[PDB]
Amino acid sequence: TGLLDGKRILVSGIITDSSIAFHIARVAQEQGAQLVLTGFDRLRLIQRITDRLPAKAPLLELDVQNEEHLASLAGRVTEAIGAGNKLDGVVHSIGFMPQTGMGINPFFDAPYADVSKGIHISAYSYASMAKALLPIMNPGGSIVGMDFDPSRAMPAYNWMTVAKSALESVNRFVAREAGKYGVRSNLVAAGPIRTLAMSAIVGGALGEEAGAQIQLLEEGWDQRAPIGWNMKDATPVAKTVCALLSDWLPATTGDIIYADGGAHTQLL
Amino acid sequence: TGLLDGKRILVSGIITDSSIAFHIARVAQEQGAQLVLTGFDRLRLIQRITDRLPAKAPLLELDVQNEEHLASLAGRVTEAIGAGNKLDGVVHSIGFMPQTGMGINPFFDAPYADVSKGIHISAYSYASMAKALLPIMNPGGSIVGMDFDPSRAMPAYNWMTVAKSALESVNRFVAREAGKYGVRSNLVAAGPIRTLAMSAIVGGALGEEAGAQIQLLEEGWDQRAPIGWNMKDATPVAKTVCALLSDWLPATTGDIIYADGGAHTQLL
Amino acid sequence: TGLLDGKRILVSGIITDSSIAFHIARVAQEQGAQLVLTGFDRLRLIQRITDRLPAKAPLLELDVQNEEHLASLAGRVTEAIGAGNKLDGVVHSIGFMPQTGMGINPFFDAPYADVSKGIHISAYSYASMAKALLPIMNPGGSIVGMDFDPSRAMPAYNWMTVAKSALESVNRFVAREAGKYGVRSNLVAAGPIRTLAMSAIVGGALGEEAGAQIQLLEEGWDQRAPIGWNMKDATPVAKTVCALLSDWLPATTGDIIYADGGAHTQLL
Amino acid sequence: TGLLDGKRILVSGIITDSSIAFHIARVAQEQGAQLVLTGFDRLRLIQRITDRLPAKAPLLELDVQNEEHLASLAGRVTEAIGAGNKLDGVVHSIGFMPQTGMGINPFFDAPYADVSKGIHISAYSYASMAKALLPIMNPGGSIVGMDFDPSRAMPAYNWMTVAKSALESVNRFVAREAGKYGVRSNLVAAGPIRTLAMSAIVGGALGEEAGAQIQLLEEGWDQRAPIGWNMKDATPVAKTVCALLSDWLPATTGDIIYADGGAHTQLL
Numbered sequence A, B, C, D: 001t002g003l004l005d006g007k008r009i010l011v012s013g014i015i016t017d018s019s020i021a022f023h024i025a026r027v028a029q030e031q032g033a034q035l036v037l038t039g040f041d042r043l044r045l046i047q048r049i050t051d052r053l054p055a056k057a058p059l060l061e062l063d064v065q066n067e068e069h070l071a072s073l074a075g076r077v078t079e080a081i082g083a084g085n086k087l088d089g090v091v092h093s094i095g096f097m098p099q100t101g102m103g104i105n106p107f108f109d110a111p112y113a114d115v116s117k118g119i120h121i122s123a124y125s126y127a128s129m130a131k132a133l134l135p136i137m138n139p140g141g142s143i144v145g146m147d148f149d150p151s152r153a154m155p156a157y158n159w160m161t162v163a164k165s166a167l168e169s170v171n172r173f174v175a176r177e178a179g180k181y182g183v184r185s186n187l188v189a190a191g192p193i194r195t196l197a198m199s200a201i202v203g204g205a206l207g208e209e210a211g212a213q214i215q216l217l218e219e220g221w222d223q224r225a226p227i228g229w230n231m232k233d234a235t236p237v238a239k240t241v242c243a244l245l246s247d248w249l250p251a252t253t254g255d256i257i258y259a260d261g262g263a264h265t266q267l268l
């Protein structure tokens, strides 16, 4: 009766109703999870977005670069879920890389300050969140972050791909920490999804050549995917995150599950 | 109401009540799947074993090297599940390598005839089974085979590790075929499990040095696994197979899920 | 004065003057290696081909499926190189998969007998050759086999890709044996090369669709390769084999060096 | 006559005579390369160290976090090698992670400022150096960085492992840039080497438990390495860097060569 029946799951990374985290949250609630959400910066916006979720969920502010937000997280969530209750699940669906960065836009021209910001928010924050939240997670718990496969370089994604490589590496370390809590840590490597930001990129936000490359990447995905890939549909990835949040992948950690249509297994 | 509520799933590879497939079957039935089982050679034995499953399941003979069994499979299962019904799930949990082979017992001394037999039953049969069964599988279906991680060589498992490397490669091709049917094909790379055969090996069936090496491998697994590994417990791997059989990994194919405690992500 | 100055190196796999092994041999001789060659089946042809090598080299018959050839190899080479001399280098450049097999031509329709033959010649023979030859190899020696990257499935190459997956796995085991002799074992994963057989395939020998797929694969290689890929030029791969045969990769074994233009590192 | 006969090669990362870069430089000079060296911070020390090299080499200051050093590099090297001469080779042998960081010393307790510094010097600087130097590199050129395998998490190395994951990812992007110059970019993943810093760690500089873990890691390396691993001997890795700097790996880029005794191919 619900994949996630009775689980308390924190879901970060909702910014629009096309956010992967929005779908993760929706599916998680459809599957009986009780949610706490974290949002960055535009919390009035995020509350209005998340009102459309099948169930209400407390929305907490988390700027993953903050420190004080991080320090007060755990307390703020236990307050939201009630004293003596702990998280069963944590979803990191946070990513950012300054344009600079990420297209466009010579790889070599991204200032380290921008790269570092990107890696902070996209990779290091996975350890941050796990640090903040593991003290309030139950044995049998699950931390899941959003990834894409960075094992091979690719056009446009540039330093974001590096940030994913760092994230994957971080996840493997987080798994070592999380294990002491009976908690799993895994990533979901998604195929490309037409999120608002992503649509804006294919639309040229970051230069025509970046857009053209992403579109090429999207098409080759689908072709390569033995079961196809629908970049307009985040549900299969939400479902995969929910599988990791459930008790049905109980021996998997420090790992990456590829919700990418099988594209990464193919080549051509 | 059951991860696998209403799914018809064929499960090969039951030979004892400590078989990984036995646990896969049990968990699958606990989760509402309707099963057809295939067994090799000792079908009276296998029926008696499988009587202990929470639900009855037709037991069909399948010797994966046979050809005629393969040719008549599909027909024999549609007969068992009823005309107009198709499989949603297929579990390959079949492995064999002649001792020779697999310890012991110099890698170089395994005759190709023995290796070939091993690869036939352990790798090629995954394509065989998919060939036989995909014509009687539903869109949204799932084929799952049992794997262990062969990306690095290891003591004792010798040609069986090669057979797993071939199996993984076969799986990626099977995924291409299965996709045309809306069907996923994936492997579960398990940590070591104290199956009867495996206990017999650690007990010295294949030489003292093979046994000692497997025991060393088992211990290092557990240590490496951020969440530990219990070689006496096949349930976490059955559960993982069930996750792949469910609709909750819908964008994963040609892939390997590691139900190994996270050990392969670690090193030390 | 010659990368391979003074090394005695056995090179299998010459069948035409466009054979990768022909280029390996030529470059090896240019670099001061003394060669023994092995050839399969058409030894009059192979002698005539190899007369074009910058230096003479004894040509020995080796049918890698034979057993007696294998058993008498070592003796036949020590005879060719002189009593008390041993090999420093061994090149396996042997591959075969029955059409059936390898295009075309449904993956599922390849009979196991054909697959097994393919794996025998393409994967198992690497262990065979190492078994035969390690007793007559010097410490500091190097065994190198020809590979292509099978980590992702691909059109057309079908069971040959599986045979490469098995070969890579075999190589890792061969490395364990070879190490006891102070000998390295590595593979070179080449990009596609317009060998006679390969040109015949792109020309349609194995069906129009196989040809079209290989041509697509060849083009995408080159595009993906950060330094490009020239399928008409086997020299960069011969050179790479020679690097593995030299003393300049002394801490590398059980490994794969990708002489593929960097294509496998890229994606798009 | 010298693997690197006539090549002009810049070698960063010499700080002591046990530095991997010192051995890279020595071997490179033994092989006929003309060197320019870069050193960080303690240039009087570094000059005194490098006086022991078989040949003199101009020593240029490079603090890879500086910007002005980076901007003036290229000009300073062309000055050292003479107008109208360009580099054939670049060696990045630069790594740093604040203790914090790297033992000890909870993974979660490393402040992002420290991690970011580590990633700056250890990963991002590979792109920095390539940016600075590719404009003064010849076609057929080679950039090589020092890596260790971060694909699996490990004790003690903590954020340095993450920095290596980022470095590997950066290398793949650098390969895309370098290719436009006819230049290869590759990494050498070394086994552990008893550098001064490393000896200080195993000696307990970073806590007893970090030391014990590194020693365990070192022992398991050697055991796993089919040809053994000698942590006191940096020569096999210098040689491997020299192989990448030569013309003998001409079709390899965006790649990693494992000079680790074959340990990463093994498991147990």
Ligand SMILES: NC(=O)c1c[n+]([C@@H]2O[C@H](COP(=O)([O-])OP(=O)(O)OC[C@H]3O[C@@H](n4cnc5c(N)ncnc54)[C@H](O)[C@@H]3O)[C@@H](O)[C@H]2O)ccc1C(=O)c1ccncc1
Binding pocket: A012, A013, A014, A015, A016, A018, A019, A020, A021, A039, A040, A062, A063, A064, A065, A092, A093, A094, A095, A096, A121, A146, A147, A148, A149, A157, A189, A190, A191, A192, A193, A194, A195, A197, A198
């Ligand atoms: N196509 C995609 O949309 C895609 C997205 N993901 C990951 O999915 C996760 C969610 O991204 P999305 O839903 O696409 O985009 P989104 O913009 O909806 O969500 C990103 C979230 O990060 C949040 N965030 C930014 N900065 C901070 C901060 N300082 N503190 C807290 N939160 C912050 C932000 O508020 C937003 O809610 C990110 O980790 C992505 O990298 C992973 C892979 C893919 C796909 O990129 C991909 C790419 C290349 N090859 C294959 C597939």
Ligand SMILES: NC(=O)c1c[n+]([C@@H]2O[C@H](COP(=O)([O-])OP(=O)(O)OC[C@H]3O[C@@H](n4cnc5c(N)ncnc54)[C@H](O)[C@@H]3O)[C@@H](O)[C@H]2O)ccc1C(=O)c1ccncc1
Binding pocket: B012, B013, B014, B015, B016, B018, B019, B020, B021, B039, B040, B062, B063, B064, B065, B092, B093, B094, B095, B096, B121, B146, B147, B148, B149, B157, B189, B190, B191, B192, B193, B194, B195, B197, B198
């Ligand atoms: N420890 C293990 O038990 C282990 C087992 N698996 C896989 O799990 C699957 C089931 O094995 P098990 O349950 O351990 O052993 P089992 O003996 O219970 O089952 C093997 C089944 O294969 C069947 N079989 C043999 N020949 C034929 C044939 N010709 N036709 C049809 N069926 C046939 C046989 O009847 C039996 O039912 C096999 O693919 C294994 O390789 C995968 C990984 C691991 C583990 O090996 C491992 C090993 C090395 N590193 C890490 C983990």
Ligand SMILES: NC(=O)c1c[n+]([C@@H]2O[C@H](COP(=O)([O-])OP(=O)(O)OC[C@H]3O[C@@H](n4cnc5c(N)ncnc54)[C@H](O)[C@@H]3O)[C@@H](O)[C@H]2O)ccc1C(=O)c1ccncc1
Binding pocket: C012, C013, C014, C015, C016, C018, C019, C020, C021, C039, C040, C062, C063, C064, C065, C092, C093, C094, C095, C096, C121, C146, C147, C148, C149, C157, C189, C190, C191, C192, C193, C194, C195, C197, C198
């Ligand atoms: N494009 C290619 O030509 C290619 C070739 N290789 C390998 O290079 C090696 C040499 O092949 P080639 O030079 O292309 O072809 P070839 O036909 O010149 O050589 C194959 C050799 O195998 C020999 N052989 C066959 N059967 C036996 C036997 N029973 N005993 C002894 N010898 C036998 C045969 O006589 C011939 O000399 C093989 O292992 C290939 O698989 C590896 C990779 C690639 C390339 O296939 C590739 C493919 C897919 N993606 C990327 C790259």
Ligand SMILES: NC(=O)c1c[n+]([C@@H]2O[C@H](COP(=O)([O-])OP(=O)(O)OC[C@H]3O[C@@H](n4cnc5c(N)ncnc54)[C@H](O)[C@@H]3O)[C@@H](O)[C@H]2O)ccc1C(=O)c1ccncc1
Binding pocket: D012, D013, D014, D015, D016, D018, D019, D020, D021, D039, D040, D062, D063, D064, D065, D092, D093, D094, D095, D096, D121, D146, D147, D148, D149, D157, D189, D190, D191, D192, D193, D194, D195, D197, D198
């Ligand atoms: N054992 C090791 O010594 C080891 C070393 N490497 C790499 O080899 C490279 C050289 O390290 P080493 O020779 O061991 O140590 P080293 O201290 O001799 O050299 C590091 C150099 O970095 C320089 N550096 C630091 N900061 C800056 C800066 N801001 N600007 C310019 N230069 C700077 C520093 O001056 C020094 O010359 C580094 O990239 C290492 O990470 C790679 C792998 C291994 C080995 O770490 C390893 C580790 C884990 N598993 C397996 C193997």
